Paper text:
Mutagenesis of Cys425 to Ser broke the disulfide bond, but two mutant monomers interact with each other via their cross-linked C-termini to form a strikingly different “close” conformation compared to the “open” conformation of the wild-type dimer, in which the C-termini of the wild-type monomers are oppositely oriented. Thus, the mutant C425S monomer structure contains four α-helices (α1–α4) and four β-strands (β1–β4). Thus, mutating Cys425 to Ser does not directly influence the interaction between the C-termini of these two monomers. In the case of the C425S mutant, the disulfide bond is dissociated and the dimer adopts a more stable conformation by crystal packing: the flexible C-termini of two monomers are stabilized by hydrogen bond interactions between the amino acids in the Ala488-Thr492 (β4) and Ser450-Met452 (β3) loops, which form stable anti-parallel β-sheets at the bottom of the dimer, resulting in clear electron density from residues Ser489-Leu495. The intersecting C-termini of the monomers result in a “closed” conformation of the mutant dimer.
The structure covers an 89 amino acid region from T408 to Q496 and is shown to possess a new fold.
Numbering used by the authors:
A (entry chain B), B (entry chain A): 0 to 88
Write the structure that this text describes.
């Protein structure tokens, strides 16, 4: 989907950007994402690739409410840091 | 792009998914990947997100060649098992 897809890319949250994003997600999900963010906010270490994706959406949510209560500033959105460890594929 | 998007998912390679995938990628690209299989098959450790993506592609290119060379018997493609250590912003 566009939202989760976007939460996995670096970009600027702007007027256009944010508008695009509010309209690609349901507020029930958006507010759900905004809640979990607290779950991860201060967590560092390994997690399954599926948990990373859910986590990134959370950060996108937070990054969005920040821009919205900025008065249309512009905020940089970078996916949460990822050091992936694979072994001989 | 189709090739990479799928290198990120688990699916059964069939005559139909081989082909869709092959048509999408140039021989140069496919072979490069196939060739990078020889790098990642032995990689064991931390890599960033783009590297993991190229890693998953080399793994799919390889699975396709395994498909092609076993007379088209189904071969399950599966992205390289991974754990991402994270921190947010």
């Amino acid at each position: 989907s566009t939202f989760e897809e976007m939460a996995l890319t670096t970009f600027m949250i702007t007027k256009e950007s944010y508008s695009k994003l509010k309209n690609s997600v349901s507020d029930v999900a958006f507010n759900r994402y905004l809640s979990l963010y607290n779950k991860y906010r201060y967590f560092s270490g390994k997690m399954d690739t599926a948990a990373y994706r859910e986590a990134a959406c959370s950060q996108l949510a937070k990054a969005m409410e920040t821009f919205n209560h900025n008065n249309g500033n512009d905020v940089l959105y970078q996916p949460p840091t990822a050091s992936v460890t694979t072994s001989f594929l």
